[PDB]
Amino acid sequence: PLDLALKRKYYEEVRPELIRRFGYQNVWEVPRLEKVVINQGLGEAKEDARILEKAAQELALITGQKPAVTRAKKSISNFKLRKGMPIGLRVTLRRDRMWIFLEKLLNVALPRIRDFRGLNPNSFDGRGNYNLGLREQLIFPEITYDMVDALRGMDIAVVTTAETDEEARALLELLGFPFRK
């Protein structure tokens, strides 16, 4: 379904807007999203995959994609780790799914967040990319209360083509990133 609200926002408003502050000589120099990634540090449930099939299908609902497990590399008995028996979930959503996802998060997820106040602006890692954590996961649409057996939040990475994050700072605000400023 190559169409949606935010998908347009970037073109018929946000694309030229960027050219206003930086004036790119070329049509591609103008930064774009192209990679949204999500990861859950469930080393907590690394014991039994029992409490894991759930957070997977839960994650799948809110993202549309079928998540992919991530094994342990090292081994640390300091907290029950060895080989690859452990666990973590990772899902790389791009294309349309990325937009239909970012619409929910910026227009539904964030606002219903317990005592929200604005995304931390410092979370820009030199190059144009943003990261942020969420203690809960029920702050998503298609998640009912009686469904969650345990509150397990996570964090999402978003990747732009922006070289410097100075530019990136702008591209996010223009899409709908409520920065704490």
Binding site for RNA (CB under 7 A): 35, 37-44, 46, 70-74, 76, 78-81, 86, 88-90, 92, 120, 122-127, 129-135, 152-155, 157, 159
Taking the complex as a whole, how short is the minimal distance between the CB of residue 16 and RNA, in angstroms?
A: 26
CA distance 174 to 164: 17
Q: Does 127 bind Mg ion (CB under 5 A)?
A: yes
Taking the complex as a whole, how short is the minimal distance between the CB of residue 12 and Mg ion, in angstroms?
A: 31
Nearer to RNA by Cβ, of 37 and 60: the residue is: 37
CB-based contacts of 175-178 (< 8 A; 24+ apart in sequence): 175/6, 175/9, 175/10, 175/14, 175/33, 175/102, 175/106, 176/6, 176/9, 176/106, 176/107, 177/106, 177/119, 177/130, 178/106, 178/110, 178/116, 178/118, 178/119
Strands 33-40 and 68-69: unpaired
Q: Does 79 bind Mg ion (CB under 5 A)?
A: no
Nearer to Mg ion by Cβ, of 27 and 151: the residue is: 151
Taking the complex as a whole, how short is the minimal distance between the CB of residue 69 and Mg ion, in angstroms?
A: 18
Residue 123's binding partner among RNA, Mg ion, none (Cβ under 5 to 8 angstroms by kind) is: RNA
Q: Does 126 bind Mg ion (CB under 5 A)?
A: yes
